[PDB]
Subunit: 25 residues, 4 copies
């Protein structure tokens, strides 16, 4: 469970990085 939660938070962070790059890359 905890590792699954870690991976979900990390995927959400990567999605925000993708969105940052869409706007500012």
């Amino acid at each position: 469970s905890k590792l699954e939660e870690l991976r979900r938070k990390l995927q959400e962070a990567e999605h925000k990085a993708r969105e940052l790059q869409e706007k500012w890359g």
Copy 2:
């Protein structure tokens, strides 16, 4: 706040990693 949201999610992931270390070392 995209970058702020990214950092918040990343902190949450790191906290889950520390919770795993509390159990498994």
Copy 3:
């Protein structure tokens, strides 16, 4: 370029977390 480097670091961490979960599964 620093936005790509940040995204790719998060992706590297995703790789490590997936591999850890594969060993746990």
Copy 4:
């Protein structure tokens, strides 16, 4: 070691995100 490596990658990504946030300030 593998959990410590994962936690380290997350800390490295936070270091990059903080650096980005400081430049964007």
